[PDB]
Design a protein around this ligand. Structure first.
Ligand SMILES: CCCCCCCCCCCCCCCCCC(=O)OC[C@H](CO[C@@H]1O[C@H](CO[C@H]2O[C@H](CO)[C@H](O)[C@H](O)[C@H]2O)[C@H](O)[C@H](O)[C@H]1O)OC(=O)CCCCCCCCCCCCCCCCC
Ligand code: CL7
Ligand code: CL7
Ligand code: CL7
Ligand code: CL7
Ligand SMILES: C=Cc1c(C)c2cc3nc(c4c5[nH]c(cc6nc(cc1[nH]2)C(C)=C6CC)c(C)c5C(=O)[C@@H]4C(=O)OC)[C@H](CCC(=O)OC/C=C(/C)CCC[C@H](C)CCC[C@H](C)CCCC(C)C)[C@@H]3C
Ligand SMILES: CCCCCCCCCCCCCCCCCC(=O)OC[C@H](CO[C@@H]1O[C@H](CO)[C@H](O)[C@H](O)[C@H]1O)OC(=O)CCCCCCCCCCCCCCCCC
Ligand SMILES: CCCCCCCCCCCCCCCC(=O)OC[C@H](COP(=O)(O)OC[C@@H](O)CO)OC(=O)CCCCCCCCCCCCCCC
Ligand code: HEM
Ligand SMILES: CC1=CCCC(C)(C)[C@H]1/C=C/C(C)=C/C=C/C(C)=C/C=C/C=C(C)/C=C/C=C(C)/C=C/C1=C(C)CCCC1(C)C
Ligand SMILES: CC1=CCCC(C)(C)[C@H]1/C=C/C(C)=C/C=C/C(C)=C/C=C/C=C(C)/C=C/C=C(C)/C=C\C1=C(C)CCCC1(C)C
Lengths: 68, 35, 65, 23, 323, 479, 36, 30, 31, 28, 59
């Protein structure tokens, strides 16, 4: 159990609050919303990549490279 | 500007919300009924 | 037992006939776009109605229709 | 063709009798 | 006890069948996939995508009905009922082949729900979930064949149409164009499946024929019998049953890797030295060369009608024959 | 003792040795990067950037390097077609150092340093930090460690997006024209208008790495402070590192699948100048359409830029290779040297017919010269058969526009047949096999190898995710 | 200071034969393609 | 009386019966 | 054929084989 | 020379069979 | 909405027949009155509502 200097610096981040949790649900409800949000985001991207969704003036193909 | 495809996707979100809401509502309501 | 027998006797043949008439009255062909036996070809329209474009497929079928 | 509905009514009547007849 | 605990206990309650949380994903998706297949076979035809009569209304047989794949022009469009293709018109959605996408996607989510269900049941009973790991193989096959393969190709049109004769067409197409039988991964898959059947058969027979006259069978007699008849035998029961589990699953995974390889035309189609040596002299003839010739013939005789969208026109002169 | 498939569990309860094996793995990965780049440099031909680009040459890591800035070599040559000019003059112009060899040197140095750190941490496995204040059992808090790591990665992502990609303080990124003609390494400017979601427009990438970068930083900060919830903490067993393994393996498999999708379908990240053309540009006639329109636009045939015609060869498609056809593509059809010019075929009556091009699927195709109106005019009958629509019986001349065979007219039946087969193979070309002993059978480009290998990897890592999720959830049983 | 977590590695004879069979059979299957 | 099993049984049987009737009807089509 | 075909086959045959033999030997030496 | 590779692998397999049959550790 | 109208009338016939069978048994024998009375009066109410709905659904 060497008491190095860097260990002194980092031990608080390592295991100061090890094994601690808040009871109940806590922030879990909020997390739910975030997941749903990204579940739309990714979905939209997929369809945009899939050409299911066609955004206005956004030609999902090699033609969009025009301008470089 | 909205295009027909994007509007279709928005209607999809509406229908999917409705389906999930009806399924979850049925499940939770029936679970609450015979507590 | 006995009670449900009344309901099932009243209902099940009605459902059977519902499907029967759905086919017999020709409604299925309209619902599902399935051609009538004479609709596969006209007297000489022996070409096949194959879709060639992704974007306007429904309209192209309407032309094929 | 029309014997189906007539038979349905013939079933309907005595069935209404019988359901009371059970009690 | 919040609403969530009530819901959880309600799901886990004993019934005729066990629902669990997994049921919320499995049952609707499985039911929709099955219903989509039944509808597609019963009413919807493929007259516009493949130019076929693959429905009962058309007058097809049970061995010839099929939920045929979408057209080739659509590429890999997801074909949502409200997408740019269908645009909310149910009839056009059916004619374009959207039922194939409906069935396949809901099948994917049904398989996922089933694996989750096995996880949940094993968690409730309190035993190792080897069943879920076993089921991982069928999911690999399904994802490799119905999703990754048509995604690596030009369109959904090249996926296996849900049917019987359509699946047979898929098998013959794969042999003709990818020469699948020569793929080593398919060989490992075949060995796995046939070995799994062999293991089931001999394990059942052995357990029946070493029964004690009352686990319940003479492991010692079975071990000695197989050692002196075949040479080798399982002296451990746990190893015996884990091997029974392990062999077919491994076969399925090897075949899955073989199928993903051919999805990119990364196929073992030929042996270079054989092609060179056949080019040098025409007398050199082996079974592999004649297999190559059969592949040429199947490609030529099937392409004009299988891929009707391409408008292939090969005259009688160019069609390979045994002259 | 342990079974051979569990030998590495001896570091499960030891944070120090677990970190040590991670560092050793990092050293191996960085060493492989360096060595592979070194090998590719040692087997490269910078002379021909047009008819022998890097993707034709079996390069694997060079396109990945070139994607985000590294183009030249200390020996001088650039991949863009010009000897490198030492435009660097000042600090912040390390660009003369970070060539291919500079990157190789840095990666080998990192490999060595990580190996030394791994040895150190293996020896000093019992540092005090791994142990809590008053319990002999080592115990780490995974949620806060995740927060710290996420914050670090968010900082690095924001820096990459805003400084390197924009070109403000970095080389920028590779951009090109829709036809893979001009390839620059230039900065990009981020735009939050919806067209930044177009996967083929590079302005999205920057816009992503900025915004997503910030999203991670916030996501880092929250997790560096916020504690988990009893409900989730007990459900996911956040005290057990195996759950982290399960979730990470699932994430990495998903990443592999998404990368394979982009590689196979093409995007702004994968430009055809680097990784080669996709398999859909051949199917949709993308380059043939473009060329035909350009010539039809009044330009003569000889004035067509040779990259645009090389892309129209079917030997460039990644869907024409094989699983065990090894090596660079030039080991296959051989290395190209010259474009014979666009050929045109005429029959006895003088009608102009065309050869149908072989699709990606067919390993061999039947040569069929058809009238533009859809009527088959002539063909090459099967290996030995008697015909009525034939090559000789009808007679066919071929005339070449541009290229090596300019103005020429071969009416010799073997010559017409050879060039008919070439025409059905895309554009006729001068290919050399004597240099490499090439086998004439094709091979797949870099793009195909990426797609295949990482689709296999993703498929396997999904099973890995399932197994490790099972061993996490069922921990009390798996013992 | 010794590490408690060290454990030996075991592989009995039967496992050796199984592994050698797997390796040799895989080599025989894949050599015909490696030589191409 | 609307048990989950009632729902399941009906969700299966109703379309099943309808489709059986439809197929029977197709059998008598010339 | 591939000049590296024989080398690949040999290394495939050998490396897992020597690994397995080493494990079995250092198992059997131990009691 | 491929023939030598094939024959060597096959001979190794046969030797493995011989040892696996007549030299297995006794089950107990 | 024509097909909707036909389906509505078919449901009306179904309900009407169900009431035809149920009403004499419910009314004559009030042994199961707790649920039977609710059944019969709810059937009557549904009958009235369906008729009123079809009244407009005709046009
Ligand atoms: C083990 C268990 C695993 C459990 C799995 C559970 C899965 C649930 C179901 C998921 C369903 C995903 C459907 C994805 C459909 C799709 O992909 O839609 C397809 C589109 C791409 O569309 C195709 O793109 C091609 C390239 O075109 C491009 O280039 C053309 C010129 O050649 C044109 O310019 C065109 O405009 C331009 O888009 C062609 O156009 C095709 O015709 C077109 O269909 O991908 C896209 O939108 C998005 C592509 C990136 C993300 C893809 C992630 C998933 C797929 C990864 C594996 C890919 C396999 C590759 C082969 C191996
Ligand atoms: C600060 C705002 C925010 C950000 C930006 C953020 N988090 Mg969180 N976040 C986590 C990861 C994370 C990562 C990896 C990450 C960056 O990539 C972030 N976060 C980022 C987990 C460690 C932790 C909870 C882990 C946890 O339980 O996550 C949910 C569980 C699972 C199984 C994930 C669901 C995955 C599905 C299987 C995917 C299936 C795919 C499908 C087949 C097809 C897709 C189709 C597509 C097109 C749509 C977490 C939390 C949590 C919160 C909260 C409130 C947040 N966060 C918030 C954030 C918890 O309650 C909660 C917490 O307890 O905080 C301590
Ligand atoms: C193949 C499916 C799979 C995946 C992809 C996977 N694992 Mg495991 N896995 C572990 C880590 C791991 C990590 C860090 C990781 C992702 O990075 C993975 N895994 C991923 C260890 C914690 C734990 C013990 C590890 C352990 O004991 O490993 C011992 C393995 C040895 C001596 C050699 C195995 C031979 C391989 C052919 C190696 C070939 C070289 C390599 C391929 C080069 C390519 C690099 C890269 C591209 C792949 C573990 C297990 C184990 C298993 C099993 C069956 C798996 N896995 C399976 C997977 C244990 O029994 C076992 C277990 O937990 O039982 C208790
Ligand atoms: C510092 C501002 C900035 C940011 C934050 C940034 N870059 Mg650079 N950046 C790269 C990657 C990168 C990544 C992966 C990344 C984020 O993850 C970033 N960058 C981020 C490499 C592709 C490329 C070379 C980087 C390169 O080779 O780094 C060396 C690699 C290692 C392991 C160093 C090992 C460290 C010692 C053992 C200790 C690069 C450049 C370069 C520049 C410059 C000026 C920058 N950058 C700048 C930035 C080259 O000259 C230079 C350049 O292109 O010259 C032509
Ligand atoms: C050993 C260091 C090494 C690694 C780890 C490595 N390569 Mg290479 N590598 C390639 C892809 C690659 C991928 C996709 C990939 C990761 O998945 C790797 N590599 C990885 C190709 C682009 C390119 C040639 C293509 C090429 O030859 O790809 C490999 C071809 C075949 C038949 C191997 C497929 C093997 C089976 C799956 C075995 C599985 C058995 C089963 C599990 C049991 C390449 C080369 C090449 C070399 C060399 C020396 C290497 N490499 C080396 C490596 C070429 O000659 C050569 C080169 O650079 O000049 C052409
Ligand atoms: C054709 C081959 C084949 C079939 C039909 C099949 C069938 C099944 N295997 C199951 C299980 C398993 N299979 C296992 C290993 C294997 N399974 C194999 C091969 C098969 N397994 C092989 C080779 C192995 C050895 C590795 C295991 C280890 C299990 C199980 O644990 C599990 C079980 O418990 O079985 C009793 C399923 C349990 C119910 C379920 O979840 O359905 C599938 C669920 C859904 C949601 C189906 C959705 C719809 C599908 C995906 C598409 C539509 C299909 C149409 C409705 C019909 C198509 C008709 C055709 C002619 C096209 C089901 C009975
Ligand atoms: C992950 C894999 C995990 C399992 C362990 C490994 C399994 C066995 C691997 C054996 C590799 C044998 C290589 C033979 C090489 C050869 O014959 O030519 C030797 C070739 C090179 O070939 C040479 O190339 C030269 C030009 O550079 C010339 O063309 C020469 O003529 C040519 O012979 O070597 C390589 O390519 C080595 C790198 C191989 C990279 C493979 C990438 C793909 C990996 C996919 C993994 C999928 C796993 C699925 C599992 C289910
Ligand atoms: C980067 C460098 C990489 C170098 C290469 C590394 C190679 C690592 C070793 C690979 C091979 C491992 C083999 C272990 C072999 C071994 O010891 O197996 C027996 C072993 C027994 O497990 P137990 O826990 O009971 O005992 C473990 C100990 O005996 C050994 O640790 O079980 C498994 O390994 C499970 C998987 C079996 C897999 C084989 C099943 C099929 C056998 C027959 C198949 C071939 C014949 C087909 C005929 C058609
Ligand atoms: C649309 C027509 C149908 C109606 C209106 C209907 C109505 C009902 C009703 C009211 C019950 C409860 C019976 C009671 O407890 O008194 C019931 C139960 C049942 N029905 Fe139906 N039914 C119909 C069609 C079917 C079909 C097609 C089947 C399958 C062949 C079926 C099988 C059953 C079974 C098995 C039960 C008993 C379920 C249980 O008690 O667990 N029914 N049905
Ligand atoms: C079993 C067998 C072996 C021995 C001999 C024997 C003759 C007995 C033989 C039996 C043969 C017979 C007659 C089998 C009859 C089978 C049939 C047709 C079962 C069918 C049930 C029908 C079902 C589920 C349909 C469900 C349809 C659904 C959800 C529709 C889903 C929908 C889709 C598809 C489009 C969008 C809208 C919506 C509503 C979401
Ligand atoms: C030690 C020292 C300290 C101070 C600084 C200094 C620079 C001097 C430093 C020296 C550092 C040096 C020279 C480091 C070199 C590191 C090297 C070359 C590491 C190794 C990289 C090689 C790797 C990963 C191996 C990959 C092999 C694999 C996957 C196995 C099988 C393969 C796979 C599964 C894919 C297909 C191909 C093949 C072969 C079948």
């Amino acid at each position: 159990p060497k008491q190095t200097w860097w260990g002194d610096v980092l031990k608080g981040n390592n295991n100061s609050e090890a094994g601690k949790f808040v009871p109940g649900w806590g922030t879990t409800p909020v997390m739910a919303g975030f997941v749903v949000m990204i579940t739309l985001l990714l979905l939209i991207m997929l369809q945009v990549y899939n050409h299911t969704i066609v955004l206005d003036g956004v030609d999902a193909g090699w033609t969009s490279l025009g301008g470089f | 500007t909205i295009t027909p495809s994007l509007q279709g996707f928005f209607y999809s979100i509406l229908f999917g919300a409705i389906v999930l809401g009806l399924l979850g509502g049925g499940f939770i309501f029936f679970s609450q009924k015979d507590k | 037992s006995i009670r449900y027998w009344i309901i099932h006797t009243i209902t099940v043949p009605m459902l059977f006939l519902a499907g029967w008439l759905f086919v017999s009255t020709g409604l299925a062909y309209d619902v599902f776009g399935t051609p009538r036996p004479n609709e596969y070809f006209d007297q000489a329209r022996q070409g096949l109605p194959l879709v060639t474009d992704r974007y306007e497929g429904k309209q192209q079928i309407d032309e094929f229709t | 063709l029309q014997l189906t509905m007539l038979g349905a009514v013939v079933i309907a009547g005595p069935i209404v009798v019988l359901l009371v007849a059970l009690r | 006890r919040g609403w969530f605990d009530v819901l959880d206990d309600w799901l886990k309650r004993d019934r005729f069948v066990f629902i669990g949380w997994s049921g919320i994903l499995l049952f609707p998706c499985a039911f929709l996939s099955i219903g989509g297949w039944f509808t597609g076979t019963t009413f919807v035809t493929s007259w516009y995508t493949h130019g076929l009569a693959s429905s009962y209304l058309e007058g097809a047989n049970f061995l010839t009905v099929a939920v045929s794949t979408p057209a080739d022009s659509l590429g890999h469009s997801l074909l949502l009922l409200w997408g740019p293709e269908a645009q909310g018109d149910f009839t056009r959605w059916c004619q374009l082949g959207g039922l194939w996408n409906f069935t396949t996607l809901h099948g994917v989510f049904g398989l996922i729900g089933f694996m989750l269900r096995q996880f949940e049941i094993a968690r409730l009973v309190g035993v190792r979930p080897y069943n879920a790991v076993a089921f991982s193989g069928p999911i690999a096959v399904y994802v490799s064949v119905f999703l990754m393969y048509p995604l690596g190709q030009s369109s959904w049109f090249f996926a296996p149409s849900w049917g019987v004769t359509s699946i047979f067409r898929f098998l013959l197409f794969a042999q003709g164009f990818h020469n699948l039988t020569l793929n080593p991964f398919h060989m490992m898959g075949v060995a796995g499946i046939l070995g799994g059947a062999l293991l089931c058969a001999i394990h059942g027979a052995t357990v029946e024929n070493t029964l004690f006259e009352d686990e319940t069978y003479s492991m010692v007699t079975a071990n000695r019998f197989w050692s002196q008849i075949f040479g080798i035998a399982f002296s451990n029961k746990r190893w015996l049953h884990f091997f029974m589990l392990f062999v077919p699953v491994t076969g399925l995974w090897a075949s899955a890797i073989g199928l993903v390889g051919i999805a990119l035309n990364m196929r073992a189609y030929d042996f270079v030295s054989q092609e060179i040596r056949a080019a040098e002299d025409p007398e050199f003839e082996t079974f592999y060369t004649k297999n190559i010739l059969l592949n040429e013939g199947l490609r030529a005789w099937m392409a004009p009608q299988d891929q009707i969208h391409e408008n292939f026109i090969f005259p009688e002169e160019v069609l390979p024959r045994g002259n | 003792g342990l079974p051979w498939y569990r030998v590495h569990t001896v570091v499960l309860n030891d944070p120090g040795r677990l970190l040590s094996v991670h560092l050793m793995h990092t050293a191996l990965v960085s060493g492989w990067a360096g060595s592979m780049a070194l090998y590719e440099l040692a087997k490269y031909d910078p002379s021909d950037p047009v008819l022998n680009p890097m993707w034709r040459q079996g390069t694997f890591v060079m396109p990945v390097m070139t994607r985000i800035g590294v183009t030249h070599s200390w020996s001088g040559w650039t991949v863009t077609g010009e000897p490198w000019v030492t435009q660097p003059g000042i600090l912040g112009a390390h660009l003369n150092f970070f060539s291919y060899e500079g990157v190789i040197l840095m990666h080998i140095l990192a490999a060595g340093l990580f190996f030394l750190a791994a040895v150190w941490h293996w020896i000093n496995w019992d540092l005090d930090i791994y142990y809590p204040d008053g319990s002999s059992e080592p115990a780490s808090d995974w949620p806060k460690i995740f927060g710290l790591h996420l914050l670090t990665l968010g900082i690095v992502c924001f820096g990459f997006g805003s400084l390197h990609l924009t070109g403000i303080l970095g080389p920028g990124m590779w951009v090109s024209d829709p036809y893979g003609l001009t390839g620059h390494v230039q900065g990009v400017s981020p735009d939050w208008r919806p067209f930044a979601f177009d996967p083929y427009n590079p302005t999205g990438l920057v816009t992503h790495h900025i915004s997503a970068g910030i999203a991670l930083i916030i996501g880092g900060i929250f997790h560096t402070v916020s504690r988990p919830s009893e409900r989730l903490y007990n459900a996911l067993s956040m005290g057990n590192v195996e759950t982290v393994l399960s979730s990470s393996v699932a994430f990495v498999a998903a990443a592999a699948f998404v990368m394979v999708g982009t590689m196979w379908y093409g995007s702004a990240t994968t430009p055809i100048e680097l990784f080669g053309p996709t398999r859909y540009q051949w199917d949709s006639g993308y380059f043939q359409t473009e060329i035909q329109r350009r010539v039809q636009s009044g330009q003569t045939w000889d004035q067509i830029p040779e990259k645009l015609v090389f892309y129209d060869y079917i030997g460039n498609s990644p869907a024409k290779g094989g699983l065990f056809r090894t090596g660079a593509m030039n080991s296959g059809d051989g290395i190209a040297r010259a474009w014979e010019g666009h050929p045109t075929f005429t029959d006895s009556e003088g009608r102009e017919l065309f050869v149908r091009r072989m699709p990606n699927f067919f390993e061999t195709f039947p040569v069929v010269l058809t009238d533009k109106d859809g009527v088959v005019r002539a063909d090459i009958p099967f290996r030995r058969a008697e015909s009525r629509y034939s090559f000789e019986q009808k007679g066919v001349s071929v005339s070449f526009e541009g290229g090596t065979l300019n103005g020429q007219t071969f009416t010799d039946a073997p010559s017409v047949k050879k060039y008919a087969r070439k025409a059905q193979l895309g554009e006729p070309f001068e290919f050399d096999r004597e240099t490499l002993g090439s086998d004439g059978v094709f091979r797949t480009s870099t793009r195909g190898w990426f797609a295949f290998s990482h689709s296999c990897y993703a498929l396997l890592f999904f099973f890995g995710h399932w197994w490790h999720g099972a061993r996490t959830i069922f921990k009390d049983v798996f013992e | 200071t010794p590490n408690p977590n060290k454990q030996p590695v075991e592989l009995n004879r039967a496992s050796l034969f199984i592994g050698l069979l797997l390796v040799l059979v895989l080599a025989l299957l894949f050599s015909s393609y490696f030589f191409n | 009386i609307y048990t989950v099993r009632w729902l399941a049984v009906h969700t299966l049987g109703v379309p099943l019966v309808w489709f059986l009737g439809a197929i029977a009807s197709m059998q008598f089509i010339n | 054929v591939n000049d590296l075909g024989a080398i690949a086959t040999a290394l495939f045959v050998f490396i897992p084989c020597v690994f397995l033999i080493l494990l079995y030997a250092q198992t059997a030496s131990r009691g | 020379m491929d023939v030598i590779a094939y024959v060597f692998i096959l001979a190794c397999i046969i030797g493995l069979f011989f040892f696996a049959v007549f030299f297995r550790e006794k089950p107990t | 909405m024509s097909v909707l109208f036909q389906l509505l009338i078919a449901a009306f016939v179904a309900l009407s027949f169900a009431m035809i069978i149920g009403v004499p048994v419910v009314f004559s024998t009030g042994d199961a009155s707790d649920d039977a009375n609710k059944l019969i009066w709810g059937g009557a109410a549904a009958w009235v509502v369906l008729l009123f709905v079809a009244a407009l659904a005709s046009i």
